Amino acid sequence: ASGGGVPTDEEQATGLEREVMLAARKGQDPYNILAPKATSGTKEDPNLVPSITNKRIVGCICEEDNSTVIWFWLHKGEAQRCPSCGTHYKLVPHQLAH
Amino acid sequence: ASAAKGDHGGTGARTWRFLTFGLALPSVALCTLNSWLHSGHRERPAFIPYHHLRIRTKPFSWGDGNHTFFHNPRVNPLPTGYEK
Amino acid sequence: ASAAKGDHGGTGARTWRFLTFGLALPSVALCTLNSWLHSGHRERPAFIPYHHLRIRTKPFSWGDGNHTFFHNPRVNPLPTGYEK
Amino acid sequence: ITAKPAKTPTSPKEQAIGLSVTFLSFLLPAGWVLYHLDNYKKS
Amino acid sequence: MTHQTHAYHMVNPSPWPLTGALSALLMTSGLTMWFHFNSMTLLMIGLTTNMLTMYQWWRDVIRESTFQGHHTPAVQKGLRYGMILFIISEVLFFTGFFWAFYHSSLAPTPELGGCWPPTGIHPLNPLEVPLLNTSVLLASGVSITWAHHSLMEGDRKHMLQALFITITLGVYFTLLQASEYYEAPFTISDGVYGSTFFVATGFHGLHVIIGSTFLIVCFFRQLKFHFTSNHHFGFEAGAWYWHFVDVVWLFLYVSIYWWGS
Amino acid sequence: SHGSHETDEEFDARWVTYFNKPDIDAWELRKGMNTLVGYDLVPEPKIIDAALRACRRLNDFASAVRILEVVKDKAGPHKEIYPYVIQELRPTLNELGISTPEELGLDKV
Amino acid sequence: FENRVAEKQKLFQEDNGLPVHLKGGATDNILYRVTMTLCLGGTLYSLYCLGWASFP
Amino acid sequence: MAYPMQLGFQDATSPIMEELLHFHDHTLMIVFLISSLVLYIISLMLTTKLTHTSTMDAQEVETIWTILPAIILILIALPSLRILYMMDEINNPSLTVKTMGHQWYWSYEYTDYEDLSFDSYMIPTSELKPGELRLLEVDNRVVLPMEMTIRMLVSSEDVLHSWAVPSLGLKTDAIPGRLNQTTLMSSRPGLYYGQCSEICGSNHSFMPIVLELVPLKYFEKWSASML
Amino acid sequence: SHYEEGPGKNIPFSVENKWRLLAMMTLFFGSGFAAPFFIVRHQLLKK
Amino acid sequence: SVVKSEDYALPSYVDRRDYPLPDVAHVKNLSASQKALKEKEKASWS
Amino acid sequence: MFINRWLFSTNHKDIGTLYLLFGAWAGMVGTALSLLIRAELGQPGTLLGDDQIYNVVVTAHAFVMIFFMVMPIMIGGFGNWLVPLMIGAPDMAFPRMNNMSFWLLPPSFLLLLASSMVEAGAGTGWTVYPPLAGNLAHAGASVDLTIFSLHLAGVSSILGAINFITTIINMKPPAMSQYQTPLFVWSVMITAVLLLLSLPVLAAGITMLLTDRNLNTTFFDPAGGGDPILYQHLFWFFGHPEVYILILPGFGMISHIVTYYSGKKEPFGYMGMVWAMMSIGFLGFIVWAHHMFTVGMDVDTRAYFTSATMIIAIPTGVKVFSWLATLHGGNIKWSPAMMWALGFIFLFTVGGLTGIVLANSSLDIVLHDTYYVVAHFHYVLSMGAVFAIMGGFVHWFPLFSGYTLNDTWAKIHFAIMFVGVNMTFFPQHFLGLSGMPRRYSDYPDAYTMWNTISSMGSFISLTAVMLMVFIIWEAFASKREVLTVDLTTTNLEWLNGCPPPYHTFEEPTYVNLK
Ligand code: HEA
Ligand code: HEA
Ligand SMILES: [Cu+2]
Ligand SMILES: [Cu+2]
């Protein structure tokens, strides 16, 4: 115990800083600070790209080595596929924004 | 010289406060006594109009343009000779 | 000289493997060509029986006790004079 | 690259004017200045 | 889009880069009138707009950080890189000066008397005050370290205390050095020895003043509860710059004051 | 993936099979060809046949024609290749009733 | 000491549509207007100078 | 001196300036090879309808276009280095003239024995006698004994200058406070012209250098008559 | 944010009238090219 | 069919030797007769 | 509004545009200075006056083209515009500071102009070496104004370099490694590092010269024991990296342009291309002294500097050969920009080859300070750096504006500019072998033909630039808005349409962790 008087973030962090701070403890990432881990990307097990809108740019690093990333808009609706490797992407609504 | 003051010169605010008043400051005290236990005064160097000194290729933009910023009359002679 | 090879000389095995074959080794290669593009041979130094050299206050515990461990006959003279 | 047709196409006549104006604006001022060099050196 | 889903900062238009750019003009052309058509009015105006700009620019920077909550993790990691990078550029600036010195002292022209220090120059004694200043800056390095540890342990009183001791040793060095400047028997005009000693120690001196006011700013932000135990980059940066400032002095001391004299 | 390289026969096979997937859909039909065109070779008549058929499966006459266009394009300056291809394809051409680009007069500007 | 940072936050977070360098109050504006003025005038002065010094 | 429509170097008047002509042929031969090799590969790449846009393997070929240039550089570096040391080589001069750049003229000093020293200005285009070279003519030629190893010590009394005489393959910046050495050595009598190779003021273009090389004997009399 | 967008709205000069632009563009690059000439004239007209 | 600027995120058409089969149909909207031609296409091409 | 958008900005896009604008204007200036130089040398005799008014023009040419045209355009323009878009960033790391990096340019440019207005200006060469640059040889407010222009321009660039490095390193998608960022970005990140290290040293060098002509210090005055040579070191320590700082970004845009018009997905040997740049970046720091061969240095140290300077030929080599390999199986599109790219590839080669000749100190003894070196650097700058700038400009113009250029007009321009430069600079190779010195307002009669042909060349180039202005005007005159762009899967800057909205990537891209 026993300290001296300097504020903690848990008590003084405000704005976005606080917002991302709390979300962090709840395990969510509404602010894209972390890398979305992939799924098998099958037609039945697609990668679920959250989004605060009806479309989102997806970059696909088809193979681990790849210096080249394949970009393309993922729109709301039927699961789409990376032009270079199939791989399914299905849009999803974003969460803890505001 | 070297150094081996046994233990603690790392991590923990108490340890750092300790070196501050236990080592750091006493040093400044020694060195301060020292620097003043020799704080006499040098005799102003004999003047000889050497050419590679008291250089003036252009007048200083202050005063009579012949006196250096921290001109000290006693120990700093003009190009012509000592102040007085 | 200095150094400023743009980016990556830190964290990530791929980056370290990269400096290994991208910088580290080519250097050893240059320096190796270099050290052999000058790998001729010095002429054995003219012998003069200086006293502060070829010191012997006690015979070496090997051989005729007058020949240094890595004695090289061509460039290392005995105290008396060159090997032959 | 593909593009919609010109919202305000520039007919050859226009283009000639524009090409002309451009060249003049580059050539006159310098021309004047260079034309009178002697007059300047003579003061 | 519209509602941003990235942790980055989009700074609102500020008129500070323009007034700051304009300030560089005022001061540079201001120095030109002084150096030539002997006058300081422009330079005075320049130094003013400059202080005004910096005051307001950092003011906004605090507003955005401490009050508005814009410095997320992603945001601070980038301010580290920026400061780190900025310090490196300073390390390369002082390099020109050390280079000039080693060039001059390692191979003295016959004009100097073909020796170093040149004939006529009377070097200061490294064992006198130059040692005192060495010990002073070093002590501040340990006390500033005690200050940063108190901070991360929520001890307000002690952080503020170690920070105070630091700030004063730093001021003590400014004064001590100021007097040496006065008492010193050589000048910027005494050839290479003076030239080389007065701009290196001088630029360094301007750095301790710039570094001390930085700490002073941190001192006040602390009375005002601005820093939390875990978010206090303004202080991290303050400590980095301070340590940079000792190390340069450690190099001047060994080169110019000891070896070069 | 890395260093995993097939013999010529294994390549052609892998493709003929690819195109014969009964459930093959448009995406895959396009992906297949747009991919095959990047390689250094005019596709084997057997591979071109399977793709001509899958066009039928997807009831795509147009695509079937453009596919025959590509083959020729790929021969570059090697005139001998195209006609040999159209030759080994006559049967299937006739069967599915696929008109050559030349027959359709699409070979002129 | 104080610790009225929370007060300052609420103030600067107030959605008054102002840009951060004005969000603070009336003095922010006087300071702004002062700085902007000296800069401009200064620029003009230097323009006058660098010109008066352009001729023999 | 240089003639109208010149392409390469002015004829070599000394052994190193000859030596360099050949080292330059060698080098220039190679730049022609490479620059033509590149123009060929380029036109080749652009001249076919055949495509192959899929992925292609690197390095296996990159070893070639990495080891080869290294070899070629060794083939230039060696001859070059050889000549370089040979220039800065152990010679024993039988004379030492000094020269000093000044803002718009060179002063020469021969002082081994007597103290012969004079100036050297360009002859104004007006004061040129028919046949004289328009901007290369100097009033006082630096006279020297042909076929002799001479040591020149270049310097200046003001801004930087550079004393250069191409035909002999020499150029040495003239720096105040510095004494740079250079070994001159002709093998043919004549007039060898040069110009100030270092920006230095209004008349940077009007301070030539002219070497009049006559046999020893004529040098000796010239000197005495020169005081 | 009242910032217009799209072709001709992301530049600090008006692109509405092809001819007013011809003038603006002309003064812009024009003045650029002429300045050095007048500087040289300036130097030449001094003593 | 008519292409629109705002269509920058939607798959598009493009004629180019190394992408023989584009992502989109040149003509999206069909006339009755076209819808008809389209029907005949499910039948034998012969 | 206008004030807030164009003077109070914090938008990489708006800032990048303001740069290109400043860059175009300054280009116009340097072009004229370049034209006076030849107008003075196109006929034996003197047109302007003494070497002073002439050399004032030369120096002003060097400074305007390097610091005010090339640097702002390639780094501030293409750099600000494309970098955040290629890595999917919302903007730069330090938006406000970034705006200051721009606003320091005009003041810096004014000082440079004022320097040639007051007194007799600075006829000192762009290397502004002392004693000539001193208060005796060049007494007066000129050189000092030149030095303050340089300080500001430097502050601007290091401030910029801090933003680029932080951005490029700290604002990429969480799952994207640096070995997944486009070569242009690598090119600008490496260039940023080179400026961050070299510029401070120049600032220390010129600050010394300033105190030497105003506060009675003698850093470079033998009188006080100074050394006029010490300045040459300091300057050149920054001087060589600068030439590489001027080409690396060009190297980047070329890698992008060539890949794109070959219809390839990626360029040949990406990681070799990354290594190649990193190496050039590094070697460029330990070879400065090849600029001081005729100065009086020890033969052994003169040996080291020629050997080190040559090894650079190797990494540059893998670059030239990798771009040829990229064109390889390509489905080539003979676009205006592809023409600028191919031009760059060959012209830059001849020029960097002509620069290997110069690495030889032995041989440099007779080539130094002559027109041979004027040829060398005009090839890598006028038909290397500038050729990259043009390709990149005609390539990304639609992206910036939303409007397209007239390809035929665009090609005529190329055709013209090509002839102009080659004519202007080719003969200079002879003028230098045959002895014509540098920085001369006049030459011995022998040199008349080549200087006459070269100046004629300089006039054609002028025409090409007048034509380029019209070409931009027409583009904005007609308004052919863009509809389709090829290869966007591998070309992110094109994914938000032309022009991209004020705020792009407001919502991050999505990139999985495999
Ligand atoms: C655009 C910037 C630029 C570029 C890219 C270059 C590139 C290089 N330059 Fe530089 N040069 C200048 C611009 C720059 N230079 C400037 C501005 C000056 C004069 C400034 C002044 O003093 O006023 C100058 C001066 C200059 C000097 C001083 C000459 C003198 O004044 O006495 C030297 C000498 O070493 C030099 C050499 C080189 C070298 C070795 C390279 C190398 O990068 C070149 C490498 C390229 C190639 C070699 C081609 C590609 C590789 C291959 C095709 C593979 C095969 C190669 C071989 C096996 C040879 N240049
Ligand atoms: C980037 C650098 C650069 C460039 C591009 C050029 C371009 C030109 N240079 Fe210059 N030059 C140098 C930098 C440059 N120069 C330097 C460093 C010196 C040495 C100074 C010293 O000695 O101290 C010099 C020296 C120099 C001399 C020798 C002076 C002497 O030593 O006596 C000559 C003379 O022929 C000359 C000629 C030219 C000419 C005719 C052009 C023409 O080719 C120019 C034609 C116009 C262009 C090719 C630019 C047009 C492009 C744009 C303006 C971009 C437009 C923008 C957009 C597309 C948005 N230059
Ligand atoms: Cu001279
Ligand atoms: Cu000269």
Ligand SMILES: [Cu+2]
């Ligand atoms: Cu260099």
Ligand SMILES: [Mg+2]
């Ligand atoms: Mg020189």
Ligand code: NA
């Ligand atoms: Na002339």
Ligand SMILES: [Zn+2]
């Ligand atoms: Zn994929």
